Amino acid sequence: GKRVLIVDDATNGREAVEKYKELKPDIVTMDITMPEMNGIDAIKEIMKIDPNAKIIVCSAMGQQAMVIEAIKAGAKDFIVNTAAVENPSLITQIAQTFGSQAVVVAIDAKRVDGEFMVFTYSGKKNTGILLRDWVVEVEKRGAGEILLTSIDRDGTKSGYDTEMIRFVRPLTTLPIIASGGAGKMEHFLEAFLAGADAALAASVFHFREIDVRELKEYLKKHGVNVRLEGLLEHHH
């Protein structure tokens, strides 16, 4: 690409096999955690109504029991955050089975005392690990793509963390999907200019702050390659 990711996030269903065919999206993402809500049962139906893919499983943590059963259903790809920080090897582990392609590492970052630092458990434990460090590590461990979310920007509807991107950019060769403060059409350009290979966004379209057709034409009128895709997800 790049590469703009339009998200529909629904939700605890059920509201999947219904939304999937009616929205023909390029991902989905599936939270499967704890053996209670029809995660695995959902996938099978898709892997039927469309034998292809592309489902990305949300593995973390300790409920691997489910992940295994999910892969038996046809799951080929995964994102990881906390469980990779606990155990960096877990990446190499997957990447060896399914290839580097198959693994995306989500990274949650926040600047503390003028220093980019990593945060886990849905962005709350300050790991005391410099972002700069983890980035390199993650690549060497065998990642595919980095899902850099800026906490200092997440939900500020005030722009992507173009600074955090630039910081990460030269430290890697891997694609970088950028996440955080999607605010206006202009903000997407800045992200691409920073280095981000992809931009993710939910709130702006959901609430029609921004028109997806218009955003395509805007970026087109500036000479950018895109390429926009449909995400889809349960749960939190």
Next chain:
Amino acid sequence: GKRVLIVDDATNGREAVEKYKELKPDIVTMDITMPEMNGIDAIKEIMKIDPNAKIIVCSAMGQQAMVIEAIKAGAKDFIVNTAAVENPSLITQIAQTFGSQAVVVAIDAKRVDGEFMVFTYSGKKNTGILLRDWVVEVEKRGAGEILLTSIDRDGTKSGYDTEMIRFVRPLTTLPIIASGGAGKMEHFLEAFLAGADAALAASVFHFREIDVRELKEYLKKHGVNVRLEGLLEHHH
């Protein structure tokens, strides 16, 4: 009180009827949304192992179908956020059935252009409604307590929004549980001093930034009344 609320948040279970007896807490909170995860089935077991209470149901939105069944199980109290903003009457509605006591209105606030504004859908739609307005409205509609969460502070581990509290304080007589940036022992005092009748916190204890025994003694050594309680919750 006041009044400090220690939260254990677990999680999609199941990890309830096990945690409840072993943790003897004063709340719980129960997310029941969509007929899939054992919300209602959980309550019944408690309402058995302890016929008393005190369960607070998380009603919102449109899945009232479940809420009704939940009340049949013995639910007496509720919190509301988005669905109250959509339909202010919904408060009067509950408060008439179960009394003003029974209803807590969560308010999500963020300052925009030097103006406290309300946000819905897990804090993302700018309602274009001044906090000052909703506060009064909510009381007149028949609320019991206000669960003021500061977005500009939520997860900053940098102090409560002592400014937002002071703003709300004189506009009401209702109790105010304060939520947001629980950072250090000192930060709890400031909150109480601001007007907050209660402080809620999860991250600080979970990750043992702060010791609960120590926090009691700290506030005691400053002459405060407390009074600390155990929350417990699924899910997001």
